[PDB]
């Protein structure tokens, strides 16, 4: 599907082909004039004509160089703009795919798609058509001219041409499968490198470099690269030798010297072959080296278009405040593997709902379904009576705030992390949000204050980054708040303080709390026990204790 992706570039590509045909003819023009200059030199022409021909040939060389440079510059600008707009399209597309796409693919695959696949289209849309047009125009024009000159010496020029064609075909056939396998290997190596960098504590404690799968995969990938590039480079170098101007000149002279000797040919008739017979080999080698780039670009275009055609979280056209309802919701991350089984639940304003249960029961995925990171398999999730599939991302996420179980921080200042949902928020808002989340004092102790960057190696403790994300959710200030195991890394005192701050802030809001520390959720208006992906009992703390069910078992285990 590389024709559908590159359809916007039809007119530039056709224009580049036509202009390259003209530029190739202009670049061949000086050597015809040099052939005439040599013929006039042998005939002892007057200095005027010789100066005219020489100056015209030099000026035509300069003109051809300038035109080639201009076409290359224009075509590279066209390629850069196409890459930029295609990358923008890919970033727009990924912004509304299901999160399962990301979880299945990984960060390395996303990086490969957005950067390396778009970069792999460069040869196809910048050099391929010009190289093909040059490699067709120059050999054909030169060979017609030389056959008109002398067919006997022009026939031996087919020998290197036919050898080159056979080498090019064999190289393409031999390397076709390895080019297909190459992007998979690059994605695997990027993933292994990313895991090696991210899992450095695990690597250091458990086995170091020797036992790491990164080293084994690195060896396997170097083996693949050698098995790919050894015969490929061998064919590439043979093609360089066969098409080289020295080779053509030597073949021309081996054919012509025995003809000039013995009188079968006039030596003046060798001048076209000496001056033009060696010009078209490089243009042939251009496509010969380019056929791999064409395959790479077509495969990259296929991958890009396949991602652009992927089904996404479309906003339906169907089209109490603060209420979240789940109506017989079911969900499966993978087909035939249910994780949520016909869950019905209602969250109302001014109430706190505690969602508890065994680890792995499906609390985080229920929260992710409310976020519409995935679409429910059955049922519907309605916020203020409107199905979330009818809301836009902006409308949905202005209404529901989320503190996720993993405390993800972006590369930037602590202010930029706290103000992630509202980047144009005042520093006073950021400071009061941090004070509510019990992280203002720590930030004040940092060297740069609120401008200190949160990158790799400049991290915080687990509780501190958790409180940063809690401050982010506080600053977002949505009518509905979903707290996914927040305060899990918090000590009891800071946990109590941030919980009191949240209770003060979300007193009239809809709050969903996921907790394993059941002692922290005894004051909830409603407690929902999620076991094996379904709600098994609902009630208050005292009611669930008196019921003597799953909740009583978990409570007894906790004490």
């Amino acid at each position: 599907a590389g024709s559908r992706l590159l359809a916007p570039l039809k007119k530039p590509l056709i224009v580049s082909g036509v202009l390259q045909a003209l530029i190739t003819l202009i670049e061949l023009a000086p050597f015809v004039l040099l052939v005439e200059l040599a013929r006039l030199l042998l005939g002892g022409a007057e200095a005027e004509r010789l100066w005219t021909l020489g100056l015209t040939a030099v000026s035509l060389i300069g003109l051809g160089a300038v035109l080639a440079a201009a076409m290359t510059l224009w075509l590279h600008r066209v390629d850069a703009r196409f890459a930029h707009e295609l990358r923008g399209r890919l970033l727009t597309k990924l912004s509304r795919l299901p999160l399962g796409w990301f979880t299945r693919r990984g960060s390395a695959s996303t990086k490969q798609l957005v950067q390396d696949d778009t970069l792999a289209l460069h040869y196809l849309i910048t050099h391929a058509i010009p190289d093909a047009v040059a490699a067709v125009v120059a050999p054909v024009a030169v060979l017609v001219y030389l056959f008109v000159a002398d067919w006997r010496v022009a026939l031996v020029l087919f020998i290197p041409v036919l050898v080159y064609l056979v080498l090019m075909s064999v190289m393409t056939i031999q390397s076709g499968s390895k080019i297909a396998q190459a992007p998979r290997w690059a994605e695997r190596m990027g993933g292994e490198a990313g895991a090696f960098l991210e899992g450095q504590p695990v690597i250091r404690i458990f086995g170091g470099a020797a036992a790491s799968r990164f080293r084994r995969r690195l060896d396997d990938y170097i083996d693949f690269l050698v098995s790919w590039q050894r015969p490929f480079v061998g064919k590439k170098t043979l093609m360089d030798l066969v098409t080289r101007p020295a080779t053509f000149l030597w073949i021309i002279l081996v054919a012509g010297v025995p003809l000039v000797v013995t009188g079968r040919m006039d030596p003046v008739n060798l001048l076209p072959f000496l001056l033009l017979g060696t010009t078209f080999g490089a243009r042939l080698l251009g496509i010969g080296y380019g056929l791999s780039g064409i395959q790479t670009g077509m495969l990259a275009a296929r991958r890009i278009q396949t991602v652009l055609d992927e089904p996404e979280l479309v906003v339906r056209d169907r089209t109490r405040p603060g209420t979240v309802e789940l109506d017989r919701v079911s969900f499966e991350y993978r087909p035939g593997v249910p994780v949520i089984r016909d869950v019905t639940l209602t969250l109302r304003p001014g109430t706190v709902t505690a969602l508890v249960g065994p680890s792995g029961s499906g609390k985080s995925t229920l929260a992710a379904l409310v976020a519409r990171f995935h679409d429910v398999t059955q049922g519907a999730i309605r916020v203020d009576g409107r199905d979330i599939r009818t809301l836009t991302a902006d409308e949905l996420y202005r209404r529901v705030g989320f503190v996720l179980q993993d405390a993800q921080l972006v590369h930037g200042s602590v202010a930029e992390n706290i103000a992630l949902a509202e980047p144009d928020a005042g520093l006073e808002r950021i400071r009061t949000a941090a004070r509510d989340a019990q992280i203002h004092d720590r930030i004040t102790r940092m060297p740069d204050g609120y401008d200190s960057v949160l990158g790799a190696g400049s991290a915080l403790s687990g509780g501190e980054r958790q409180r940063v994300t809690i401050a982010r959710a506080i600053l977002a200030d949505t009518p509905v708040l979903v707290l996914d195991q927040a305060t899990a890394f918090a000590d009891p005192e800071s946990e109590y303080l941030v919980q009191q701050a949240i209770n003060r802030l979300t007193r009239d809001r809809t709050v969903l709390v996921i907790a394993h520390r059941l002692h922290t959720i005894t004051h909830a208006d409603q407690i929902v026990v999620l076991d094996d992906g379904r709600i098994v009992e609902v009630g208050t703390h005292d009611e669930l204790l008196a019921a003597g069910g799953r909740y009583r078992g978990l409570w007894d285990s906790g004490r």
Binding site: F214, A246, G401, G558
Partner: protein, 563 residues
């Protein structure tokens, strides 16, 4: 080019010398074959054209020799490129686990990612694709100019004067676009890091509505990358124009000297006609170097990143070892002081943990109790003071003896993308199935194997993202328990577990058959029931310590902590 010779393996130096010799031979053969046309065409246009047979024979010999030399140069360049690739990548893989944690800034992380990402066919084909054609093109017109001295001294001098402007243009081409290429590389690296962040942090960015390009950081990075790339395209024009003008000046000098010698009668007309072809051969390297100029700067950036990773400061180490056969050692802190940058983390912390006992470390968030475990494990080294394992300073231990002593459960469990059993087997890849089953049962991973459809063959995502928090936490606990180390460091290993799993795992950690010196960190009182001793860490100093009953009865900070 000395940076590349630095990266060559020591056993491959003979191949580099042979490659240099054969490259010089290839250039000399090409230059001689170009200039041999002048005698050949002078003889072919004379009254005795049969004199061209000798020069045609010499041309055939030089051409066949050039074919053989260039094939061998290609083979040697391929071998050198892949040997250098293997050596550099293996060196970076071996060095990175030993590099200090402070080195891994976001810039250094990006540099290391790029250096590892250079493993593809572009860097491996460095010698064949860049150095061989660059050296051939740079030296060819010099070799032609030298070979023309045997035809005419002033003509060879004119050719060499053309080579002078060739080298001047080649030197000046880099300067005219160094800044643009540097900015382009920086913005490309920033875009790569923002793409990786965009993929990893997708949920939080979507919830924050920071996911569209107009509002995302990756969108800003894309805009900056595009602007820098356009600027690089514009700023590469002066170098191309400079190479073109150098070629035109060399053409003017060569052709003018040839015409002057021809009209003066010192050069024959057939020799001038052959010199047209020699001039065409002479000017081809001018365009080749112009084509190769950007690749030289790209290769320079790549090798700079690789050398930056190879120059990273490796942690201090030694050669000591623990004598006993994996017996539980004592853990001692001796005036240990640690700081992240200028922020002090530990203030002269001193304690001794008896061999084989279970110790608990508790305290507020940010008090340094993860730093204590990292110092015990050797992930971090003290700024001053000593960490001793059985009386042996950890900094003086061999790296293999150091890691073989400690197994760790980290606060934020990280699993590698793969099967669940592969992640558990990281603790001990040689463990028999019974030991792996025991480790999984102790960590309550056996529940997952029946709940999940694929069992222990379940594909874990990047990190443990295809599992829940408690599931990946239990998998990491199984990994830590599988390792037969005499020291076990537990860092809030029940944070993501419900009460039943928490109690089961807490009992299992104490019920591990082998003797270990166990240090536990937890914010739950129920997670430290089996702790013989407790350390209360606050603001980087041990406020109090003792037994749980003693500390509870004391009514100190420990009692207020759980109040």
């Amino acid at each position: 080019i000395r940076t590349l010779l630095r990266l060559v393996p020591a056993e491959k130096r003979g191949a580099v010398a042979g490659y240099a010799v054969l490259t010089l031979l290839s250039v000399l053969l090409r230059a001689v074959g170009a200039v041999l046309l002048i005698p050949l065409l002078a003889a072919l246009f004379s009254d005795t054209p049969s004199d061209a047979w000798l020069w045609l024979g010499w041309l055939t010999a030089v051409t066949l020799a050039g074919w053989v030399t260039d094939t061998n140069t290609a083979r040697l360049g391929f071998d050198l490129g892949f040997a250098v690739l293997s050596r550099t990548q293996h060196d970076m893989a071996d060095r990175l686990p030993n590099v200090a944690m402070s080195w891994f800034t976001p810039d250094n992380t990006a540099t290391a990612r790029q250096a590892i990402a250079a493993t593809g066919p572009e860097l491996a084909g460095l010698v064949v694709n860049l150095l061989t054609p660059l050296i051939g093109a740079a030296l060819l017109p010099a070799a032609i100019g030298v070979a023309l001295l045997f035809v005419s001294v002033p003509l060879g001098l004119a050719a060499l004067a053309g080579v002078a402007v060739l080298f001047g243009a080649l030197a000046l081409s880099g300067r005219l676009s160094r800044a643009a290429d540097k900015v382009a590389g920086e913005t490309n690296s920033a875009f790569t890091e923002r793409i990786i962040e965009f993929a990893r942090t997708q949920q939080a960015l979507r919830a924050a509505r920071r996911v569209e390009p107009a509002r995302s950081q990756v969108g800003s990075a894309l805009a900056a990358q595009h602007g820098a790339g356009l600027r690089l395209l514009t700023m590469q024009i002066p170098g191309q124009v400079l190479f073109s003008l150098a070629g035109q000046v060399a053409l003017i000098g060569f052709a003018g000297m040839a015409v002057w010698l021809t009209v003066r009668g010192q050069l024959g007309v057939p020799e001038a006609i052959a010199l047209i072809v020699v001039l065409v051969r002479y000017l081809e390297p001018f365009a080749a170097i112009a084509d190769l100029a950007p690749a030289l700067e790209t290769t320079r950036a790549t090798l700079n990143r690789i050398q930056a990773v190879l120059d990273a400061p490796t942690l201090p180490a030694g050669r000591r070892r623990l004598d006993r056969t994996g017996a539980a050692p004592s853990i001692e802190f001796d005036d240990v002081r640690f700081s992240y940058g200028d922020e002090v983390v530990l203030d002269g912390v001193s304690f001794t943990l008896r061999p084989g006992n279970t110790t608990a470390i508790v305290g507020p968030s940010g008090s340094g109790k993860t730093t204590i475990l990292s110092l015990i494990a050797g992930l971090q080294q003290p700024a001053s003071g000593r960490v001793l394992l059985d009386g042996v300073d950890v900094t003086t231990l061999d790296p293999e003896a150091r890691r073989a002593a400690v197994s760790v459960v980290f606060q934020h469990p990280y699993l590698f993308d793969g099967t669940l059993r592969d992640n558990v087997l990281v603790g001990d890849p040689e463990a028999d199935p019974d030991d792996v089953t025991a480790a999984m049962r102790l960590a309550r991973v056996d529940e997952l194997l029946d709940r999940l459809p694929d069992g222990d063959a379940t594909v874990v995502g990047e990190g443990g993202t295809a599992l829940s928090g408690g599931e990946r936490q239990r998998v990491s606990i199984a990994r830590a328990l599988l390792k037969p180390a005499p020291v076990l460091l537990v860092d809030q290993a029940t944070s993501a577990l419900d009460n039943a799993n928490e109690a089961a795992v807490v009992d299992a950690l104490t019920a591990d058959p082998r003797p270990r010196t166990r240090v536990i960190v937890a914010h739950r009182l129920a997670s430290i029931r089996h702790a013989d001793r407790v350390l209360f860490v606050e603001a980087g100093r041990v406020v109090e310590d003792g037994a749980i009953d003693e500390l509870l009865a004391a009514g100190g900070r420990f009692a207020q902590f759980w109040a």
